[PDB]
């Protein structure tokens, strides 16, 4: 019983964290095989005016780097630019490189953040990619380079490297190909996060977990067709429901179908009327159907 936003065990990823320093800048990097990936702003001589990263790279001095894993320092063989990342070839292989892949995450998908400072993991927490391509995370200065990951059958799937925090205090990274999520810029310019919508399918997963845990006071006796709901959602800051195949086992488990839940969502979106649902006083879209099923059943 219970529902917690949890992370997968971080040990496999902790051994891949390095500190990357250049001049006045210090952040974290990801050491896989003989390569270090880190945000390319570590070589910026400003962060207050618009950086020409190509220029900065061209005038760079390889010896001005300081890359370390604990006490182990790494010699830099070469640097190439990889979107918003530097791809740093180092003189040593990381013997603790896990089996890994890269995958870009989509809005609505969950993953794990390993928050790092000075090349060492400080914390680990689960996040969910928002519709405007940000995450509601917790980061202060020095956190850039912090990796996002999912672990699936022993393989570490890397999906995020932290880059910046917007004016609203929400967070933006790039994937491991160096493509920024949401097309935000790694510049100190004035960027505003876009509009953001509740992932309805995630909210459904949450309500199913609420039923499985014996929360039922909010459950509607009315139904509403997906068609009809979708008309309402787009005026009320929620996404349209596309696929309902992912609710088969949960509806089988609970005897409650998607249509009753969509009706409940309409009531609850307005207000929780003074009450709580698994400790929440408003609807969350931080849980996927996958997390819920795995957490309720294994």
């Amino acid at each position: 019983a219970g529902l917690r936003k949890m992370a997968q065990p971080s040990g496999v990823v902790e051994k891949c964290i390095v500190r990357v320093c250049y001049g006045n800048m210090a952040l974290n990097g990801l050491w896989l095989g003989d390569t270090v990936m880190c945000p390319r702003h570590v070589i910026a001589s400003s962060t207050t005016s618009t950086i020409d990263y190509d220029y900065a790279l061209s005038v760079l001095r390889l010896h001005n780097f300081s890359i370390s894993s604990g006490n182990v320092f790494l010699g830099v063989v070469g640097v190439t630019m990889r979107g918003a990342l530097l791809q740093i070839k180092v003189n040593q292989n990381n013997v603790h490189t896990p089996k890994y892949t890269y995958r870009t995450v989509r809005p609505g998908e969950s993953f794990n953040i390993l928050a790092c400072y000075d090349g060492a993991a400080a914390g680990v927490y689960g996040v969910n990619m928002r519709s405007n391509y940000t995450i509601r995370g917790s980061f202060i200065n020095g956190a850039a380079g912090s990796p996002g990951y999912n672990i699936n059958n022993g393989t570490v799937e890397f999906c995020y490297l932290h880059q910046l925090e917007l004016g609203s205090g929400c967070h933006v990274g790039s994937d491991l190909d160096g493509v920024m999520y949401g097309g935000y810029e790694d510049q100190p310019t004035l960027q505003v996060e876009g509009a953001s919508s509740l992932f309805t399918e995630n909210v459904l997963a949450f309500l199913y977990a609420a039923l499985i845990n014996g929360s039922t006071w909010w459950l509607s006796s009315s139904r509403i067709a997906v068609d009809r709901f979708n008309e309402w959602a787009v005026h009320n800051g929620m996404t349209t429901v596309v696929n309902t195949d992912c609710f088969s086992i949960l509806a089988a488990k609970t005897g409650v179908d998607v249509q009753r839940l969509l009706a409940s969502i309409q009531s609850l979106h307005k207000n929780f009327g003074g009450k709580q649902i698994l400790g929440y006083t408003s609807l969350t879209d931080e849980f996927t159907t996958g997390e819920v099923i795995r957490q309720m059943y294994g």
Partner: peptide, 8 residues
């Protein structure tokens, strides 16, 4: 304004 989160 966006804050690029490297440290000193």
């Amino acid at each position: 304004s966006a804050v690029l989160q490297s440290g000193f």
